Design a protein around this ligand. Structure first.
Ligand SMILES: *[C@@H]1O[C@H](CO)[C@@H](O[C@@H]2O[C@H](CO)[C@@H](O)[C@H](O)[C@H]2NC(C)=O)[C@H](O)[C@H]1NC(C)=O
Ligand SMILES: *[C@@H]1O[C@H](CO)[C@@H](O[C@@H]2O[C@H](CO)[C@@H](O)[C@H](O)[C@H]2NC(C)=O)[C@H](O)[C@H]1NC(C)=O
Ligand SMILES: *[C@@H]1O[C@H](CO)[C@@H](O[C@@H]2O[C@H](CO)[C@@H](O)[C@H](O)[C@H]2NC(C)=O)[C@H](O)[C@H]1NC(C)=O
Ligand SMILES: *[C@@H]1O[C@H](CO)[C@@H](O[C@@H]2O[C@H](CO)[C@@H](O)[C@H](O)[C@H]2NC(C)=O)[C@H](O)[C@H]1NC(C)=O
Ligand SMILES: *[C@@H]1O[C@H](CO)[C@@H](O[C@@H]2O[C@H](CO)[C@@H](O)[C@H](O)[C@H]2NC(C)=O)[C@H](O)[C@H]1NC(C)=O
Ligand SMILES: *[C@@H]1O[C@H](CO)[C@@H](O[C@@H]2O[C@H](CO)[C@@H](O)[C@H](O)[C@H]2NC(C)=O)[C@H](O)[C@H]1NC(C)=O
Ligand SMILES: *[C@@H]1O[C@H](CO)[C@@H](O[C@@H]2O[C@H](CO)[C@@H](O)[C@H](O)[C@H]2NC(C)=O)[C@H](O)[C@H]1NC(C)=O
Ligand SMILES: *[C@@H]1O[C@H](CO)[C@@H](O[C@@H]2O[C@H](CO)[C@@H](O)[C@H](O)[C@H]2NC(C)=O)[C@H](O)[C@H]1NC(C)=O
Ligand SMILES: *[C@@H]1O[C@H](CO)[C@@H](O[C@@H]2O[C@H](CO)[C@@H](O)[C@H](O)[C@H]2NC(C)=O)[C@H](O)[C@H]1NC(C)=O
Ligand SMILES: *[C@@H]1O[C@H](CO)[C@@H](O)[C@H](O)[C@H]1NC(C)=O
Ligand SMILES: *[C@@H]1O[C@H](CO)[C@@H](O)[C@H](O)[C@H]1NC(C)=O
Ligand SMILES: *[C@@H]1O[C@H](CO)[C@@H](O)[C@H](O)[C@H]1NC(C)=O
Lengths: 163, 425, 204
C-alpha cells in the first residue's frame, strides 16, 4: 500500500497481524520485526478548486485544497479546507463565490469572509403599539420557469454501428 | 384483517346542525428533509488509486469520469440551493424584544436559548441530539464529503429571524416591511382568518394561551419520548452513509478477476493478461460508480421535491395563514413555527380544532312579515323554543335582528323556512 | 436573468456532445473506427473488437438516456409548477404567500420564452408605515366594542378605526363596530366614546 504509519493505541491479540475498518479497509498493522502496532493512515489528498472572478475583471486566483489541513500542503484554514491566495477579512458581506462552512470569497485582491445572512432589524414590539401602512408600492417581479426541453431521437443501430 | 377505523355514524337529518361550543389549540409536528450530504468522487483515485497503468487503460473509456464529477457537482450545488430556498427567505434578521411577554403565550421552547453556546432552541437542540471509522474509510478511498455552505448556527439564525418576524409582526414581514402588532391582536386576526370572531379570542385569551403552552410542552415531550419521530431525516443520513459504504465495499470485489488488488495483479501476471484483469476491475468499479451516481441523482430529485415542499410550507404556513386544508396541520390552521433540524426543517403547526359540539335545530331562513330573512354571516339555530343566529365555528347565540340578517324574497320559495320574529333596533 | 432556461439548453447540447464524444473512445479496443476493425482483422477477433466497441457505446447511450429521463422528470415537475402558476396567478388572484411574487398578489402576466415561461407578478407592497397606539376593544356604556373589519388606532389623543393594510382613520361608530360582552373580560380594553348615527336624527 501507501500511507503514513502513526503510533497506535489499539491492543492487538497475539495471533492477529493486520487490522480492518468497518468498511473492510486496512487501518492497522503489526510490524513483523518488532511486535508493535501501527495505525496505517493514507496520505493526504484533496480536491484542488480554483476561485476566480471573471477574466474580464481580473486574472488573480485563489486555490482551495478541500479537506487538506494547511500544514500538509495569504494562507487561511477553513473547515472546507486550506485556502491559499485570499486574505481573511473580519467584515461580513453577501456571498459572491461560495467556499463552504459559512465562508465566501469575493474580489474587491481576493478576500475571504464569513457571509452575512442579512441586515439586522429589530422590530419595535410592544403590547399596545401597531404599525399601519400609509402608502403602497406596486411591484412587478419576474419568475422564470423552464417548461420543455429539446426533443431528441437517437438511431440506436446507426449510432452504435453505422453502416 | 386490519381494521380501517372506528365506526362512526353521523346523525344526519334534514333540520339539525352540530355547532362547536369549545376549542382546542393543537400543535402538530411536520418533519421535512431539505438537503443531503454533498459528495465528491475522484474517479481516477477511486477506480485506479496509485496505478499509472490502470489510469492509462481508464483513459480509453472517454469522458465517463467527467460526467460523474459533473453530476455530483450539480447535486452538491443543488443541496445548497435547497437550503437557501427553504431557510433564506428573509433579507432582514429580525430579533425578539428583550421582555418576552406576548400576552400569556410562551415561546421559550422555540426561541433561541442565550445560555447555550449554539444559540439553538430547546426543541432544535433536542432535534440535533436525536438525529445522528466510517467517515475515515469513506475519505481514504477518494470520496470526499463537502461541508454545507450554510452552517447549523446560520440556519438556526435564519429560523430565529423567521420566528421573530412571525411573532412580533405576524404575516406582515413576509409580504413587505415588518409591521409590529401585539400578539393577542395578531392571534385575533388569525381567528378572523378561520372564520371566528375577535371576541372569542379576546374573551378566552388566557385559556388559549394555556392551551398553546401545554401543546408546545407536549410537542417537546413527544419528540423526546418517541424514537421514530425523526425517522425521515435519519433515513436520509442512513441512506447516504450506506451508499458510500457500498461503494467502498465495491473496491473489495474481484469482478471476475483473480484479485481485487491492482498491485498483486501487476506483480503476478504478464501485461497481456494483466491488462485484461485491470480492464475487468475498471469496468466493475466504473459500473459501481455509475450506479452510485444514478441513485444519488434519483435521491437528489426526491430531496429537491421535498425541499420545494418545505419552502412552500415555509412561505404559506410560517409567513402567512393558509386556508388550504391539511397543508399546515390537521385542523383550521392558525400559524406555524420553523425549527432547524439536521438536513431538514420541522414545522410546528398551531391549528384550531373545534370541540364539545352540541346539537341544535336549524332552518335555512326565518319568515317574518311575509319576508324571508337569511343570515349575513352565521346560521340559524334553535335550542328547542327560541331561535338565534350564531357563527358557524363557535356557539354564540344572538337575537335575530335586521342588523345580522338580510331579506331576499318572500316565504313561499325557500324549503324549510320557519316562522319567527325578527327584532328591529 | 435568464440563466435557468439557457442552463437547460446548455445541458442538452452538452449531453449530445458527450454522446458524440463517446464515439471517439476505443473502450479497450485496437481502434475506435469500425471500418478499420473490419478492414484489418479476421472475423474471430474482429467480433471481439466490435463487441468491445458495442458494449462501450451501448453503455454510453444508456447513460445518456438515463440522464435524459432524470432531466425529463425535473422539467416535468417545473412544467407542472408553471401550469399551476398560470392557473392560480394569471387566471385568478392567489392568497398563497410567495406563490405569485413577493408581496400581496394582485395579478400576473404570462410571457413566452425559449423553452419556458416568464411570469410578471404584479403585487401590492405596503410602504411608509406609521406607529399608532392600539387597543383590542373600546369600552362604551359598560359594553365592549370590537371592529367589524378594521383595527383600533390612536394618534395620541383620539381613537379611530382603520383598515389593517392601509391607514384610513374613521370615527368609531356602531356601524363599524360590534358589541360582545361587557368591559370586564377583555384584557387591554380602553375607554372611548362610540358615536351613534341615529342620535342627531332623533335629536333634530
Ligand atoms: C405615496 O407615495 C407616492 C410615490 O409612490 C407619492 O407620490 C409622489 O408624490 C411626490 C410629491 O407629491 C411627487 O414628487 C412624486 O413624483 C410622486 N411619485 C409618484 C410615483 O407619483 C405620494 O405622494 C405618497 N402619498 C402619501 C400620502 O404619502
Ligand atoms: C345529536 O343527536 C343525535 C340523535 O338525537 C345523537 O346521535 C346519537 O348518539 C348516540 C351516542 O353517540 C347513539 O347511541 C345514538 O344511536 C345516536 N342516534 C342517532 C339517530 O344517530 C348525537 O350524538 C347528538 N349529538 C350531540 C353532539 O349530542
Ligand atoms: C372549554 O374547554 C376548556 C378546556 O380546554 C375548559 O377549561 C377548563 O375549565 C374547567 C372548569 O372551568 C377547569 O377545571 C379546567 O382546569 C379548565 N382547563 C383548562 C385547560 O383551562 C373550559 O371551561 C371549556 N369551556 C366551556 C364553555 O365549556
Ligand atoms: C415559559 O415556559 C418556560 C418553560 O416551559 C418556563 O420555565 C419554567 O419555569 C418553572 C417555574 O418558574 C420552572 O420550574 C421550570 O424549571 C422552568 N423550565 C425551564 C425550561 O426554564 C417559564 O416560567 C414560562 N414563563 C415565562 C414567563 O417565561
Ligand atoms: C333557549 O334559550 C333561551 C335564551 O337563553 C331561553 O330563554 C330564557 O330561559 C331562562 C331560563 O328559563 C329564563 O329565565 C329567561 O327569561 C328566558 N329568556 C327569554 C327571552 O325568554 C330558553 O329557555 C331556552 N330554551 C330551552 C328549551 O333551553
Ligand atoms: C307562518 O306564518 C304565516 C302567516 O301567519 C302562515 O300563513 C297562513 O296560514 C294560515 C293557515 O294555513 C292561512 O289561513 C293564512 O292565509 C296564511 N297567511 C299567509 C299570509 O300566507 C303560515 O302557515 C305559518 N307557517 C307555519 C309553519 O306556522
Ligand atoms: C415606532 O416607534 C419605535 C420606538 O419608538 C421606533 O423604533 C426606533 O427606530 C429608530 C430608527 O429606526 C431607532 O433608532 C430606535 O432605536 C428604535 N427604538 C426602538 C425602541 O426600537 C420605530 O422606528 C417607530 N416606527 C416608525 C414607523 O416610525
Ligand atoms: C389626532 O387626530 C385628530 C383628528 O384628525 C386631531 O384632531 C384635529 O386636530 C386638528 C389640528 O389641530 C384640529 O384643527 C381639529 O379641530 C382636530 N379635530 C378634532 C375633532 O378635535 C388630533 O389633533 C390628532 N392628535 C395628534 C396628537 O396628532
Ligand atoms: C373606564 O370607565 C369605567 C366606568 O366609567 C371606569 O370605572 C370606574 O372607575 C372609578 C375609579 O377607578 C370607580 O370609582 C368607578 O366605580 C368605576 N365604575 C365602574 C362602572 O366600574 C374605569 O376606571 C375607566 N378606565 C380608565 C382606564 O379610565
Ligand atoms: C526479529 O529480529 C530481531 C533483530 O534484532 C531479533 O532480535 C528478534 O529475536 C526477532 N524475532 C522476533 C520475534 O522479534
Ligand atoms: C324533514 O324530514 C322529515 C322526516 O324525514 C319530514 O317530516 C320534514 O317535513 C322534512 N323537512 C324538510 C324541510 O324537508
Ligand atoms: C403593557 O406593558 C406595560 C409595561 O411594559 C404595562 O404598563 C401595561 O399595563 C401593559 N398593557 C397591557 C394591555 O397589558
Amino acid at each position: 500500500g501507501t500511507g503514513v504509519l502513526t503510533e497506535s493505541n489499539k491492543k492487538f491479540l497475539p495471533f492477529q497481524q493486520f487490522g480492518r475498518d468497518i468498511a473492510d479497509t486496512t487501518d492497522a498493522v503489526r510490524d513483523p520485526q518488532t511486535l508493535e502496532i501501527l495505525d496505517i493512515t493514507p496520505c493526504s489528498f484533496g480536491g484542488v478548486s480554483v476561485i476566480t472572478p471573471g477574466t474580464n475583471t481580473s486574472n488573480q486566483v485563489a486555490v482551495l485544497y478541500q479537506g487538506v489541513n494547511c500544514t500538509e500542503v495569504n494562507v487561511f484554514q477553513t473547515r472546507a479546507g486550506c485556502l491559499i491566495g485570499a486574505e481573511y477579512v473580519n467584515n461580513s458581506y453577501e456571498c459572491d463565490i461560495p467556499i463552504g462552512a459559512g465562508i465566501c470569497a469575493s474580489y474587491q485582491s481576493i478576500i475571504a469572509y464569513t457571509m452575512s445572512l442579512g441586515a439586522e432589524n429589530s422590530v419595535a414590539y410592544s403590547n399596545n403599539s401597531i404599525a399601519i401602512p400609509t402608502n403602497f408600492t406596486i411591484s412587478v417581479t419576474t419568475e422564470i420557469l423552464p417548461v420543455s426541453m429539446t426533443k431528441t431521437s437517437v438511431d440506436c443501430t446507426m449510432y452504435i454501428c453505422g453502416d | 384483517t386490519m381494521s380501517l377505523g372506528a365506526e362512526n355514524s353521523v346523525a344526519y337529518s334534514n333540520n339539525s346542525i352540530a355547532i362547536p361550543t369549545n376549542f382546542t389549540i393543537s400543535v402538530t409536528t411536520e418533519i421535512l428533509p431539505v438537503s443531503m450530504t454533498k459528495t465528491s468522487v475522484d474517479c481516477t483515485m477511486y477506480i485506479c488509486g496509485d496505478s499509472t497503468e490502470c489510469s492509462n487503460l481508464l483513459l480509453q473509456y472517454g469522458s465517463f469520469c467527467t460526467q460523474l464529477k459533473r453530476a455530483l457537482t450539480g447535486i452538491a450545488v443543488e443541496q445548497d440551493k435547497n437550503t437557501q430556498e427553504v431557510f433564506a427567505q428573509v433579507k432582514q434578521i429580525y430579533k425578539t424584544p428583550p421582555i418576552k411577554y406576548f400576552g400569556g403565550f410562551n415561546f421559550s421552547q422555540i426561541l433561541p436559548d442565550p445560555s447555550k453556546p449554539s444559540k439553538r432552541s430547546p426543541i432544535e437542540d433536542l432535534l440535533f441530539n436525536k438525529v445522528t471509522d466510517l467517515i475515515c474509510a469513506q475519505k481514504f478511498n477518494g470520496l470526499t464529503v463537502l461541508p454545507p455552505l450554510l452552517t447549523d448556527e446560520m440556519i438556526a439564525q435564519y429560523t430565529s429571524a423567521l420566528l421573530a418576524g412571525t411573532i412580533t409582526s405576524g404575516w406582515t414581514f413576509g409580504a413587505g416591511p415588518a409591521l409590529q402588532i401585539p400578539f393577542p391582536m395578531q392571534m385575533a386576526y388569525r381567528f378572523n382568518g378561520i372564520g371566528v370572531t375577535q371576541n372569542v379570542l379576546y374573551e378566552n385569551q388566557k385559556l388559549i394561551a394555556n392551551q398553546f403552552n401545554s401543546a408546545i410542552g407536549k410537542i417537546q415531550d413527544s419528540l423526546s419520548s418517541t424514537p421514530s419521530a425523526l425517522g425521515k431525516l435519519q433515513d436520509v443520513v442512513n441512506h447516504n452513509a450506506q451508499a458510500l459504504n457500498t461503494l467502498v465495499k465495491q473496491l473489495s470485489s474481484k469482478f471476475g478477476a483473480i484479485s481485487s488488488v491492482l498491485n498483486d495483479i501487476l506483480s503476478r501476471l504478464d501485461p497481456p493478461e494483466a491488462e485484461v484483469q485491470i480492464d475487468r476491475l475498471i469496468t466493475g468499479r466504473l459500473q459501481s460508480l455509475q450506479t452510485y451516481v444514478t441513485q444519488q441523482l434519483i435521491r437528489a430529485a426526491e430531496i429537491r421535491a421535498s425541499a420545494n415542499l418545505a419552502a412552500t410550507k415555509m412561505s404559506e404556513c410560517v409567513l402567512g395563514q393558509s386556508k388550504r386544508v391539511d397543508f399546515c396541520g390537521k385542523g383550521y390552521h392558525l400559524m406555524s413555527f420553523p425549527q432547524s433540524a439536521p438536513h431538514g426543517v420541522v414545522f410546528l403547526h398551531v391549528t384550531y380544532v373545534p370541540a364539545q359540539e352540541k346539537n341544535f335545530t336549524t332552518a335555512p331562513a326565518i319568515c317574518h312579515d311575509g319576508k324571508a330573512h337569511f343570515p349575513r354571516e352565521g346560521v340559524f339555530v334553535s335550542n328547542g323554543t327560541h331561535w338565534f343566529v350564531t357563527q358557524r365555528n363557535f356557539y354564540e347565540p344572538q337575537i335575530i335582528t335586521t342588523d345580522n340578517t338580510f331579506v331576499s324574497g318572500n316565504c313561499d320559495v325557500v324549503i324549510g323556512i320557519v316562522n319567527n320574529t325578527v327584532y328591529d333596533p | 436573468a435568464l440563466g435557468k432556461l439557457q442552463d437547460v439548453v446548455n445541458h442538452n447540447a452538452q449531453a449530445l456532445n458527450t454522446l458524440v464524444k463517446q464515439l471517439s473512445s476505443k473502450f479497450g479496443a485496437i481502434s475506435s473506427v469500425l471500418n478499420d476493425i473490419l478492414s484489418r482483422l479476421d472475423p474471430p477477433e474482429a467480433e471481439v473488437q466490435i463487441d468491445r466497441l458495442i458494449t462501450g457505446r451501448l453503455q454510453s447511450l444508456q447513460t445518456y438516456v438515463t440522464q435524459q429521463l432524470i432531466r425529463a422528470a425535473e422539467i416535468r415537475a417545473s412544467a407542472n409548477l408553471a401550469a399551476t402558476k398560470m392557473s392560480e396567478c394569471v387566471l385568478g388572484q392567489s392568497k398563497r404567500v410567495d406563490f405569485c411574487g413577493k408581496g400581496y398578489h394582485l395579478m400576473s402576466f404570462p410571457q413566452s420564452a425559449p423553452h419556458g415561461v416568464v411570469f410578471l407578478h404584479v403585487t401590492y407592497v405596503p410602504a411608509q408605515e406609521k406607529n399608532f397606539t392600539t387597543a383590542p376593544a373600546i369600552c362604551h356604556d359598560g359594553k365592549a366594542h370590537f371592529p367589524r373589519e378594521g383595527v383600533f388606532v390612536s394618534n395620541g389623543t383620539h381613537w379611530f378605526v382603520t383598515q389593517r393594510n392601509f391607514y384610513e382613520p374613521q370615527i368609531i361608530t356602531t356601524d363599524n363596530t360590534f358589541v360582545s360582552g361587557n368591559c370586564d373580560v377583555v384584557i387591554g380594553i380602553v375607554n372611548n366614546t362610540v358615536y351613534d348615527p341615529l342620535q342627531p336624527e332623533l335629536d333634530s
